Structure formats: structure tokens, C-alpha cells
Amino acid sequence: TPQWNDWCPGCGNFGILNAEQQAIVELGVDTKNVVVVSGIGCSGKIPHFTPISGVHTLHGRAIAFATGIKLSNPDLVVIVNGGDGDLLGIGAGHFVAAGRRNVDMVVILHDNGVYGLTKGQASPTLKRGENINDAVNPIALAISSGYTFVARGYAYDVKHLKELIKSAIKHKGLALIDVLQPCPTYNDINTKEWRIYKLDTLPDWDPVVKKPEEVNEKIKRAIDKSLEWGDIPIGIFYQNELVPSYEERIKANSPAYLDYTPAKQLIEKEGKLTTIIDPLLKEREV
Amino acid sequence: NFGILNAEQQAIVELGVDTKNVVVVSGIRTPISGVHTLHGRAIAFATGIKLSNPDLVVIVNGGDGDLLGIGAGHFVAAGRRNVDMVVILHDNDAVNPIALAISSGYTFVARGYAYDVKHLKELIKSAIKHKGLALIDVLQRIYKLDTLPDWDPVVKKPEEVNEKIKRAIDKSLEWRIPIGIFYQNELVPSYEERIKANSPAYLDYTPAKQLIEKEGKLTTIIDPLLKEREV
Amino acid sequence: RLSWVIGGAQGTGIDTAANIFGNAVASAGYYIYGNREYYSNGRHSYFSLTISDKRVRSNTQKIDILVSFDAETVFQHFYDVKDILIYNKAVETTKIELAERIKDFVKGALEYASKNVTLIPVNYDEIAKKVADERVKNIVGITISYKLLGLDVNYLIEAINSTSYDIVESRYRRRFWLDGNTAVAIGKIYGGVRFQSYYPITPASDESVYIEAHQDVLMEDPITGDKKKGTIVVVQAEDELAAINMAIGAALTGVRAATATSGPGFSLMVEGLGWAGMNEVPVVITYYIRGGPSTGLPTRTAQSDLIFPIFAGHGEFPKIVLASGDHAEAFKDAIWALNLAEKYQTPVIHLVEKTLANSYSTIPYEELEKLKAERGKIVESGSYKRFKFTEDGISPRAFLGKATMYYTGDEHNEEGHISEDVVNRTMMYEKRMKKLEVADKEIPEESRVKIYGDLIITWGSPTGVLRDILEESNFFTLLQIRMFSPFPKNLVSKLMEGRDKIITVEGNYLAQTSLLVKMYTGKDVTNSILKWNGRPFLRDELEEALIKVIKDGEKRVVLN
Amino acid sequence: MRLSWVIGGAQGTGIDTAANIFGNAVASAGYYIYGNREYYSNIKGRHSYFSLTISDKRVRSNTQKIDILVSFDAETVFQHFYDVKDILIYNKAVETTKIDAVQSMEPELAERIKDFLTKQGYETTVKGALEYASKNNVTLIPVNYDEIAKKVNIVGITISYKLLGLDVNYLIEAINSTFAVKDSYDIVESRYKERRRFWLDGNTAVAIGKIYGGVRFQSYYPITPASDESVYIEAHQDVLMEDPITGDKKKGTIVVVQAEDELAAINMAIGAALTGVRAATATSGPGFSLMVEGLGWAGMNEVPVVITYYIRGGPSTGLPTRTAQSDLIFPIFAGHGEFPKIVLASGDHAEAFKDAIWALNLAEKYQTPVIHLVEKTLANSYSTIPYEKLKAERGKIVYKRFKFTEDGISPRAFLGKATMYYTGDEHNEEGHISEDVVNRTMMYEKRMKKLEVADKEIPEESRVKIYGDLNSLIITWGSPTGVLRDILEESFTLLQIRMFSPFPKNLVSKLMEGRDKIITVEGNYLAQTSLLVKMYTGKDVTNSILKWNGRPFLRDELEEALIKVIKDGEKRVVLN
Ligand SMILES: CC/C(O)=C1\SC(CCOP(=O)(O)OP(=O)(O)O)=C(C)N1Cc1cnc(C)nc1N
Ligand code: SF4
Ligand SMILES: [Mg+2]
């Protein structure tokens, strides 16, 4: 069990870590099947955990690693943690491509404003003027990419974060939770201190698609809400379970897929290859 | 293909740009120079060309798979810098270039049909002329936003951006298929302009024109750099 | 040994024509080695095959029979033609960079061929009008040249139906049609690959396209005989970075995962390769060597990429590298590569020249056939430490879902946690490197090398050309290196020990194989035969250059 | 007379400034310094230390053994107690602390110190370590930084400064020109100019080298050893240029771009170079692995570009903050398809500065990428450098961009100043795509000929350095060179390879010809330099001294390995 946590005193990650552990306990998932896949950075050092498996990746590549794990063994429950530099700079391509695919997994973004572990350079979420580059809009990009469950949360409201994380896992398809995490060591602005309100408050807020005719209308409401910043919403901006996951699209093609997954197939018995090649070779006889 | 290329020559001619300062960068004439780059990397190359010599006019030509597949990280990164150049896009699921371009934003975003070539040519002239990073998605039901009641995609006051973004995004979900300019916001400074504000000499003596050497002798002076390091 | 070429414009049934000819001639009982040459598109291509009594593993520059329907093909090939030249009469009076050089080197070209080639004009346009009311040049065509061979039309009608004659007069075991892509595809399927990810790239897409077409797979049991239905997941990644990273992800699960790329692509996978090496992950990359650098010659071949793949990646880590020489080996090596990956818990690069990918041949079944599985040091469960310190460097391998484990690209302790501890780093780095030393004692040197006759040192496709040069002329020991890491240094050195001429043959400017040979043995080669023009080695051209090396003592022969 | 000083501390707690103050003041009094920072891939909480050598004579390295340990906490004591030889300054207010108490220390380290101390055997407290120190002749000095903190970092360095017996008026200046001494000065008593000199680390030497060398476009992705090089360049991006024949000053700008990834970074710089600008990037192992595709295109289209490659611990993420010499064969043969690359490696701070300029000149002359290897030790080590007449070689500048010549080098025009075609696809003299067999053979040859020409025009003597002279040769490159030159001042021929491509074949054969003992010394496992030496010369090294533990070679440890090779033997000595 021993492994020491070297986050700075005060770091939004302590919160993400806590919400995520709690998310899994409460959800009654077999921890034997949980795998947390993380990119590079401060955020990448989770775990740090409870006996969960952890795959610490390459910078920007978590989503590609996570997709291979998931399609080989769809029983697993794959969570991805990455930094802002990670998922939206160097890994932005993997980020957009993943929404085309709709794999059942959770992507959790550590919205830091900075390259923390590399000594504080502006991340792709830092606004110009804080810095010569604009910030991207994570939630809007996810919706465009896109991306069948989307949400924002705050690392200093573990309660709310834990419930986002839970419904993201329950969600069948690719979820994104964008988490605002302060960095007392390198983000002088966006302290905490630094405003937040919850969408779930608003009188008639309904982010779930019930029928496919209300797709565009739910998108448009999610984009409007993604534009507020300065004096900041939080919660589930959009959700749509009518879109089939990638694993459902493999079945509509390969019925035996979900019954006999790649991770369970026995290619060998006592070092003897079990796969039948004979029609492949027969179709090529002279 | 033949038509998209043609429409680029003619916009260049019609805006009166000097052909010796045009570079066309693409993935995998007259006297226009061409740079055939690596797969999905044209924008990074273009960025480098344009920032060393801002007097050049840099057009990026790419395929749907080139940008927005392999190049999709360069695509969104470019939207953060707002470099004065133009990206012409020659159009499991598929992605929405317009929405991704506005969400990553991308300060001129448009759609043309591959013929109307007239209309495309006027879009290309708008893009070049536009101060910042323009994208034209080109398709190869259709109607022109240009011909609606009060369609004005241009932001002219800081308070209009939200309303302009919301309308562009709505129109980018229509599929009635809109073509034209969805969004133009020249209140966002160019990347070159942002360099100027910190390094004021940049435009009037550019990195490409700087003489770093006279007959084998290095003309830079480092003495003040070496003085701050003295024991 | 006869040498046949058909040529013309792309998408003009010249491929099906070639297919049929080759089916016909092969089902009679002869052997074929075929290969196609083409540009990146309209343009001109041709198919060159050699027909022979015994196994044939090469082509020739020179052409015995040339079938041609346009002026282009005559112009392209007339200089190489030796015996028969079938041509279209309708193009007899057609005028012309390749073209510039041909302006001094159609009538004029036949003028040249006469002085000395038998010259068969054909009323192609006329023959086709006589099929009416009853792209047909192609069939006669293959018919004229087929009766030339003096084989019974019964076999060539057979071939046409499973998809003129008398114009001219006659002049002259279980087996499989395999190309390199197909042979690898079928190796991987048989070898147990249940996850292939890839990005489309010219020589390598065909392999994954075949695997996806045959993803619906059937597995038996030797005991019960109970057959079970399986599925190979094939993902088209967004880029080559995604491709390896998916494969590596999938391998942590226990599945045999692979990918296939070519040069541009491999350069993008170097980061992933390093993670797999750091984390002791089995994964194989099929590396199709094509003309480089950079984009290079996408439709052409080379042997340019050898030292790079052996030494790719930015620290030190074990990787196994394996090089196929013919179509049968391509099928064997795919399976050997998987097993090696799993036994030594490390990435394996399987090198395959582009020449072998697209070229095809008639392969006799006894290849073979015996192929087993080795899953290495693998546990079901599940206190377990993934990277347990072990004498042979190979830690017992549990799979995701079966044990609590930690993987990381940072240096790590036995748990897989991050450690910057000086003692752990020394021990843990050594452990990964030991596995290569263990592979060197445990893989017999004689398996990493193939020896014919009894010095020419080579690898890959020129090996088959050099074997075909061990009947014609009274000629050497032929040493094919098969595994470059761990390199068989003691055996290669011993084999280099008692001779006057040591020649190296390879498709490189730098003669990389000599560089490697020298690095591990200290011994130099006496001569080198090189080529880098994007074209395979040819039987005749290589014969003549070998003479230059042996007669005139020429140190470095370049094949233009 | 060389003196070993160490100050330790938790990452984030003061430090840096404490070592840079002490270091400045000792240097201002005309003494020479070589200082090195050892720290974790961490921002706050882990143990860092600064090792400095003090000397009357130029110095190039550090030792395992310490003569003065300054410690303010308890972790420092445990981390180092074993290595102290003379004085150990400690905080008395943490004399009671157990090992089990110390949360920061990697558990694997904590065990070793626990037993040690149990065998021996003392308490497994700080006291226990301090008490071990005493029975190995270490003079303890108790300190009450608490008592002083309320009766009023600096106190620690001030005590150790008094131990030297130098003038307090440098410490002061050192403390004034940067931002107590009255008290701490008087608790223990003493126990022990010529030319301009500059403080440099490898990063700053390269950055200043690039600024002076004409670099006006630099792209980078943040990565630990090399984001400091850019940043420094960005901070001084507004630069002055003057020629003699007019005298006129003219102000310029170095564009520094923080790219989205390393692919982008190399691709922007290549892009910049077509324009005629001198362009460069800076990276480390993970980033270089991503740049290989770009290097290929630059090789193919004969584009000058320099990549500064800092070598950190690998493979993969590896040891982000630690050094190695692991990356030699890889950069030399990086890329598919064969193309000229020039590869250069610095062995000290001054050479870092000069090679950066040389690399720019070679890029431009042979129209090809140039990789400049700098170990991460050089980047984080710093030293007092004396005056170490340096020119520009813009090569063959002025239409067919790839016109054939016999030396392989085509006259170069820039974008804007001529109509040009560039492509990654094989191409003819105009730069258009050409699969033609004769063009192919000729064009591939022409690129490759450039390197044969470099092989002739660069003398072999400028590609190496030679020190000492004897019957027992040592071959090395990079930072151990400095360590071995310091060893030559107290009781062999030392050959330092500088350029590995084109490699100085014949000079190395020649120089190996009459010896009993040939020893490679390098921070890697495979002994990569020996493999290169054997590749090019056919000859073998007799022995190796190797180290792969993330730590630089140290003066005392490498001296004990030499003896153990030379007097004694053993083929292969692994440093601990
Ligand atoms: C182990 C520490 C290390 O080497 C790091 S950490 C790091 C962090 C980037 O910040 P982020 O926003 O993704 O994470 P944060 O630290 O949580 O802000 C980078 C870019 N790197 C460097 C790096 C750069 N490029 C590649 C390809 N790989 C890398 N590891
Ligand atoms: S740096 Fe910012 S992010 Fe990295 S640990 Fe210290 S605080 Fe948390
Ligand atoms: Mg971050």
C-alpha cells in the first residue's frame, strides 16, 4: 500500500483524487475492473490512490491507450485523467477523434491554466493577457467533436464532482468532465477566492436528450452556457444516450464480439495454435 | 480540385497581391512557390514561414483527412494564435469543421460550394483580406446566408461576440444547407500584432530581413548579455 | 526460366490479364514469381513474371516475351526485349525525362528490336470488331503469348471462367498464391492477433484490409474438438501515434496486438515504442520498408531502414528486430515475432521490404505447417508486483482485470510506482537490458541466420535473387541475416573467417549491413554491391555486377 | 586545493538563492566554482541539494564526498551523513527525529539508512546518523536556527563562509545585490580577479550562443531541461545589431514561439528556415522522438535547422530531472531513408556556447539538420568561466533549388526572393516530384555526397580534443571529460570526441595504435561510444567504466574506478 503524494500544499488535484475514489466506492464497481489511465504532468501522478490499477501514459496519448484497453476488454471501466496541456494541446487530435468513435469511458480534464510540472508555462486554457495565446473552450470543443456527455465541475466541491463522475461512468458512451483546478504554485490568477454557480439550480435546466428531434435544441442550449465566463456555470451541459457506442457498432457486424471479447479468446492450448486457417489458405490454392 | 485551385489564382490576382510573395503550403503558376509538406503538418510549417516573413501571403490547402484527422491538433492550436493566413479545406462518424473552428476559434469561418466558383473566389478574397486566421470549408438544398433578411456575421463591438457565436453555431447544425461567411471577428489581434506590442521593431525589420552577418562577422552585440553574467 | 512482361495504362484491365495468365500457367504445374511496378496515381505500369520448372524468387531486367497494346509500353520496354515482342499494328507509326532519354537510346523502336527480335503485330482493333454483334486486347494479349508457350488451351479457358489462339504458332504438390501482405496477415490471424490498429499507408493498408475482411474467426480445441467463434478488432486510428498507443493499450489486456506501417509512420511511433520497452509490453510492428527519406517513393522499395529501427528511441531498452527474405518467411516470421514479443516481453519490429509486399509467387505447402505458440511467463492472477526483480530480467506477466498493477513511462520500482532512487534505477535499468542478453543465449544463433551453398552477406529480398544465382554460372556461400537484435555475432564472425572475397549486397547507399557487421564483429567486408533507385535487385543485373566484383576487384559496385 | 560544499533542503524552501548567494560571494573573492543542482521530478516537498567545488584553480566537476554539509531540516542529514568527511552543520531543533518520521524520503532510501545504522549500530534517529558521523572524524556543529529566527538560510551559508575565513564584505555585497550576519558569524571560527569571468549554465551558454549566432526564429515545447533556454531567449528577444562599415545600430526581434507539440515545433522552425532565417529548436528525449519525421523532411529538402538535444534519463518519460549519455546512436541514425545529419556534443559550458554557433554555421554550409547533444548535467551545472574570434558561415547563398554540383551543395535562395518548390516526395532539380530512376539515383547520391565533403572540409583534429599523454588511452565525450581532466591534475591520454557525424575515423584508429589499456568512460549501459569506435575503426576498447543511475560522474568515484581498471583490471566497472 505505501506510495507518497508530492502535490503542493493546496492543489485542486487532492479534490479530484477524493471525488474519484468516492465515485467508484459508492458506485459499487468491482475495483478489480477499474483502470485509471493518466497522461503526463502533475495531474498524471494519480494514483496515489484503494487497490485500483493505474496506467501512466505518454504526454497527450491517454485517450489512445484507453481506447485499446477498452475495446480489447469492454468489461473494464476505464477512466482517463489528463492535464489541459495534455488533452487540449499535444493530445487535441486524439481529443477530437475520440468523439467520432464514442467509446464508453470517462475523460477527466485537470483545467490548471498552466504546465505545472514543467514550471508554469501558459496552458491552452489560459486566456490571452494573463501570455500571447488564446484559450480554447473545452466544453464547446467537446460538443463540436463530439461527444455524447459533457460537464464541468469544480475541484473544491467534492460532493458535486463525485456525482458528475458517477453519472459519467453510468453513461454509455464517451463522457467529458472538465474540472477547474487551482494551482497555488503557478496560477497567481484563478485562485479560489476567484463566482462559481451551479446550472442544476436554474428553474427548467434539462441537458438530457429524450427523443432525437430535440438533439439540435439541447446542443444550442449547451453552447450558450459554455460561453459564460467572468462573474461561471457548472454541472451537466449536455447528454445524449441515443448515439450508439463504438462497442455497439462492433457488434452490428460481429455478434460474437461482446460474448467472446479479444481479451478472453484462447489463441493457444498447450502451445498449440487453435485458430482455423484452412479456408484462408484454401481460397488461395492453385 | 481544378476549380478550387483556379479560384485561388483569381482571388490573388483580383486583390492585387504580388505573386513573388505568395506561398501555397499543402500536405501530402505563373511563378507561385509551393511547399509540399508532411501529412497533416501544413499549418505548423505555414505558421513558421509567416512569422519569419510577415510580408508573405500564406495559403494552406488541405484535405478533410489531412487537417481535421491527422492534423486536428494543429487545427485547434492555430485557432489560439490567430496567425494571418488562410486555410482552405477540400471536404465511425464525421466532424463539423465550422463548429470545431468556432469552438477553437478561428476568427473568420466560412463555407463555399465547389462551383459556384464566383462565390468561392469572393470568399477567398474576404479570407485573405481578413486580418487573422481564416478557414474556408469547401463542399464538393444549398443556399446563401448572404441572401437572408438581416444576416450579419461580422463582430464590430466587443459586446456582440456571444450573439455572433450563437448564430454561427446554430447555422452550422443546419443540414437547407448554408454557405457563405458564418463568423468574422477582427477585434481579436493577429499573432503578428501581439508580437509587435511586446517587440515593436518586429514588422519594420523582420527576422527574414535581419542581417546577422556582414562579410563573415556577427553583427549582434551581446556585451550587455555577458555583463549581467559577470562574477 | 522464361521472362514475361505485360504493360500499359493503369485501370485498363492489365492486372486481371496478368492474374489470369499467371493462374493459367501455374495450374499447368509451373512456378511463378510476379511483381508490379507503378507510379503514384493514368500512368504506365507493367507486370513482370518469371515462369520456371522449379521454385523461382526473382525477376530480370531483360524480357523474353513482351505483350503490348499502346506506343508507351513499346517505348518503355523495347531496349530490354530479347525474344518476342507482341505489339498493336495501329500504333506502328507513333512519335514520341524518361522520354527525352528514349529520344536517343515506335517504328524506330521496332527497327531497333529487329536487328534481334521476332516481331508480332496484332490487328487488335479488328479482332474486337469481329467480336460483335457477338478492353479485349488484353485477352489476346495473354492468348498469343500463352500459345507461344505451347501449353493446352484447356488450362487458360479454366482461368478466364474463374474470373486469337492460332494467330501465332507455338514457340516453346499443393501450392498457394501469397503476396507479402497476405502472408503476414495470415501469420497474424493464425498467430493469435486479436487487435490490429493502423493508419493507411501504401504498402501496409492491404494487410489490415485483409485482416478486417477476415475478422470473423474460428478457433478449435485439440482435446474436445469444440469449435468457437471469435472476432479480430481492427481499428483505423486517427494517426500513427494513436495506432501504436492503442496496440500497447490492448496488449496490457493480454491480447496479442499489432500494427503495420511504413517509414514515415514508423518515425511517428518511436515515442510509443519507448513506452512499450520501458513497460515490458509485447507488441509487434510490421515495418514495410519503402523508398525514403520522408515521403520518398511511396510505390517503390528500399533497404534503407535498418540501423534506425534497431536503435530508435531515446534511452536504452530491449527490442527484437527480424527481417524476412521471401513470401514464406513473411508468414513464418509474423508468428515468430508474436511469440518473441511475448517470451521477452518487449517490442518486436518485423522488417519487410516493399518489394516482398506487392510481389507474389507460387509457394509449396511445406512451409510449415511446425508452428507453435509461446505466451511466455504469464500468470492468471493476482502482493503481486509487475516488475519483480528476476535473474533473467523477465517478470511474471499478469493482465489488466486480473491483478492490481501500475504502469508508467517514468522509471519505476517493482510495483510500477515512480522512483528516482539511485539503487533501484541501476537495478531496474539492468533488468530490462538483461532480457536481450537472455535472448542472445536462448535463441540459437543458427535460427537467426540462413546459409545457402558453401561469402555473400545479405538480408531480405536480394537473398532470393542470390539463391536463383546458385545454379546459373558456376558461382559462393550465401549468408542471410534474419535477426539483427540480438545479432548473431559469434556465428557471423566464424562464418567470415576463411575466404578471400566477402561481398555485401543491399539496397542502401551507406551499406548499413557492413556497418552492423563491423560493429559487432570488428571485421570488414571486402566489397559491396549497392542499389538505391527504388527498384528491386534483378537476377541478370546482379549476376553481371557480381562479375565486376570478382573479376575486376571493384570495391563498391553501384547498380544504376 | 579543492573543497566540497553541499547545501540540502526541501524543494520550495528557500535554497537556490542560498547557494547562488554563497556561490557568488566565494567567486567574487577570486575563487573558482563548479556547482550542480540535484532535485526530483517534483515542484514542492522533495529533497534537493547543491554540490559546489571551491578551488584556486579552474574546476570542472563535483565529488561524492562532502567537506561541509549545511542542513536546516532533518532529511538532509539522513540523505548525506555517510558522505560528509569534515564538518556537518545541523539544526539542533530536529535532533530527535526518527527515519519513520520523514514523509518526503523515498521509502527505498529510508530502509537502507535504517539498516545501515542498525548494523553498526546507532539509534536510527538523526542522533544516530550524527553519532556515526563523529566516529568517522566528522566535526558536528549544532545550530539553533529557531533561537535566531525569533531573536531577530542565510545563517547556514554565513557559518560555512566563516569556516573558510574569507572577508565578510563579499557575502554582504552578495546579499545586498540580490534582495542576521552579525549573530551567526560569531559562533564558530575559521578552519581553512586576474580576468573577467562569467557565471554560466549550459542553457544560458547555448541561448547566448544562439542569440549571437544569428538565430531569429526559435520554437519549442516546454520540457524540463530546455524550456529555460527559450524563456531566456524570449526575455532578451529585442536585440541590437551593428556593422563596422556604417557603424549604425538597428534593432531586431527573435520570434520565440511556444508550440502545441514537438512536431509543430520542428515543423515551424523548418518552415522558418525556408525564408532564410537561422532557426532552431530545443528539446529532450521524449521531444526528439517526436521530431524524427520532421528531421527527415529537413534532410530531404536540404533545410538548415539546429536542434539542441538535451539528454536526460530514459527511456520514455524516464528520469525528467536527471542526466544520461544514453542517446548517441539514436540521433546519429534517426530517420527513415538515409540523409546527411551533422552531430556535435559539448563537454563543458564554454563548448556549449561555441558549438551552438558552430552548429548554426554547419547547418547553413551543408544545408542539412544539425543535432547538438548537451547532457542535462551541463544544463543544470554552472561555473565560473574565463574568456572562452568566432565568425559566420552562411554557406552558398544567392532558378533550380536542387541543381546538381560535384560537392552536392545547391545554391540557396529564400522564399520571397525566388520561385521554389519543396516536397517530401523524391524530387528533381526544380523540386517537383520525380519517380524517374536516373534522377532518383543522382539526387539521393547528391544529398549523401554532402557528408563526404564535410568529412574532408572539417579537419579531423577539430572534431576531437586531446589531453594528457601516456600508454593508458581513455575515450569519452561530454561531461565526464571535465571530470577526467580534473583527475589528470593528480597522478593517461584523454580523447574527447566532439563530432560524431561525420566521425573522425582515421585519427581515432591512429590514436588507439600503441596502448596496453583502452578505456571507454560514459553514462550508458550498452557502451555506445565503443560500438561507434568499433563500427568505424574495426578496433575494440579493452575496458569500460559505466554509470546509468541518473547521476553525473563524480571526481572521487571515477578515480577509484580507474585504479580498479588500471592497477587491478576487470573489463567492466559499474558506478554506484
Ligand atoms: C515527467 C515530466 C515531464 O517530462 C513533462 S510534464 C509536462 C506537463 C505538462 O502540463 P499539463 O498541463 O499536461 O499537466 P499539469 O502539470 O497537471 O499542468 C510536460 C509537457 N512534460 C515534458 C514532455 C514534453 N513533450 C513530450 C512529448 N513528453 C514530455 N514528457
Ligand atoms: S504545481 Fe500547481 S499543480 Fe503541480 S502540484 Fe504544485 S500546485 Fe498542484
Ligand atoms: Mg496543466
Residue numbers in the entry:
A (entry chain B): 5 to 53, 56 to 136, 145 to 208, 212 to 248, 250 to 304
B (entry chain D): 17 to 44, 55 to 117, 147 to 195, 212 to 246, 249 to 304
C (entry chain C): 2 to 42, 45 to 99, 108 to 116, 126 to 135, 137 to 155, 165 to 193, 210 to 218, 227 to 423, ...
D (entry chain A): 1 to 152, 168 to 194, 206 to 218, 225 to 420, 426 to 435, 442 to 515, 518 to 536, 540 to 624
Give the published text.
In archaea, early branching bacteria, and amitochondrial eukaryotes, the reactions are catalyzed by a much simpler enzyme, 2-oxoacid:ferredoxin oxidoreductase (OFOR). In this study, we report the crystal structures of StOFOR1 and its paralog StOFOR2 (STK_24350 and STK_24330), providing insights into the substrate recognition and reaction mechanism of the (ab)2 type OFORs from extremophilic archaea and bacteria. StOFOR2 and StOFOR1 possess domains III (1a–228a), I (228a–500a), and II (500a–627/628a) of the a-subunit and domain VI (1b–305b) of b-subunit but lack domains IV, V, and VII. The TPP molecules of StOFORs accompany a Mg2+ ion around their pyrophosphate group and are buried at the interface between the a-subunits and b-subunits.
We have been investigating the function of an (ab)2 type OFOR from the hyperthermophilic archaeon Sulfolobus tokodaii strain 7 (StOFOR1), which is composed of a 70 kDa a-subunit (STK_23000, corresponding to fusion domains III-I-II) and a 34 kDa b-subunit (STK_22980, corresponding to domain VI). StOFOR1 is one of the simplest versions of OFORs because it lacks the intramolecular Fd-like domain (domain V), providing a good model system for studying the molecular mechanism of this class of enzymes. StOFOR1 shows broad substrate specificity toward 2-oxoacids, such as pyruvate, 2-oxobutyrate, and 2-oxoglutarate, suggesting that it has multiple roles in glycolysis, gluconeogenesis, the tricarboxylic acid cycle, and amino acid metabolism. The crystals of StOFOR1 grew in solutions containing PEG3350, and we could collect a 2.5 Å resolution data set. However, the very low reproducibility of single crystal formation prevented phase determination and further crystallographic analyses. The StOFOR1 structure was solved by molecular replacement using the StOFOR2 structure as a search model. Superimposition of the StOFOR1 and StOFOR2 structures indicates that they have almost identical active sites. The methyl group of pyruvate in StOFOR2 and the propyl group of 1-hydroxypropyl-TPP in StOFOR1 are surrounded by Ser41a, Thr349a, Asp468a’ (the prime mark indicates that the residue comes from the other protomer), Lys49b and Leu123b. In StOFOR1, mutations at Lys49b and Leu123b, which correspond to Ile843 and Asn996 in DaPFOR, affected the substrate specificity. The K49bR and L123bN mutants exhibited strong preferences for pyruvate and 2-oxoglutarate, respectively.
